[PDB]
């Protein structure tokens, strides 16, 4: 019956929906179009910040990064502010997660190194976590504007949820680094209308969102029941039939999150 309700939301919203919640000791995995590819958009910024944390000393966070006004290619609510000053790797991390800053991300990719301005190193980091599916080929803003049916810059709800699970709930990062990432997602400012809206207020929610053309809207979160039981929730959608200028349906992600909550409840 769960499939039928996702299928209905699909039709109600003229959208394609993809959902995944990893299995636990007491609940089966939830999955709808869990293995079909969807555009990363900005949801990569989260495992990116963990790439940066993994490969470096804590100390590295204090390193100041200098950029110019022409480095600003995409929505950068924070970067443009500190161009005169620049930002530490820490302030870049913070903004790539909490505000989805396109430049902050573009910088951190570069701080990873190698071909494709960081993106080879980043897909390298996903590989190191067992994810053989996902791939980041381009950097902001080109990665939110791939044609529907294009492999590049995509992931699955399945693949991103297992990744996110290792980062926050698992052992991918040492505890010190673990709480940095987690704390940054808990104070994310871009997701109030998505998964977080679809879950009762007494469930704790951390997340990182993604938005793109063709009516792309994503949200990936780690939720805690009132009793403290964690689950990983990955919700992705596009609306290809509305074309490039199609509008993202936030209410789709919020509703699908409510269906998910009722089943976990």
UniProtKB/Swiss-Prot annotation:
One of its GO terms (biological process) is response to antibiotic. Substrate binds at residues 100, 209-211. The record marks 45 as: Increases nucleophilicity of active site Ser. Is inhibited by clavulanate. It is found in: Periplasm; Secreted. Its EC number is 3.5.2.6. GO terms for molecular function: beta-lactamase activity. The active site is at 42 (acyl-ester intermediate), 140 (proton acceptor). The record marks 75 as: Functions as a gatekeeper residue that regulates substrate accessibility to the enzyme active site. It catalyses: a beta-lactam + H2O = a substituted beta-amino acid. Exported by the Tat system. The position of the signal peptide cleavage has not been experimentally proven. Extended spectrum beta-lactamase (ESBL) that inactivates beta-lactam antibiotics by hydrolyzing the amide group of the beta-lactam ring. Displays high levels of penicillinase and cephalosporinase activity as well as measurable activity with carbapenems, including imipenem and meropenem. Plays a primary role in the intrinsic resistance of M.tuberculosis to beta-lactam antibiotics. The class A beta-lactamase family has a specific amino-acid numbering system, sometimes called Ambler or ABL numbering and often misspelt as Amber. A multiple sequence alignment was used to derive a consensus sequence and then the consensus was numbered taking into account insertions and deletions. This allows use of identical numbers, e.g. for active site residues, despite differences in protein length. UniProt always uses natural numbering of residues, hence there appear to be differences in numbering between this entry and some papers. This is Beta-lactamase. It comes from Mycobacterium tuberculosis (strain CDC 1551 / Oshkosh).
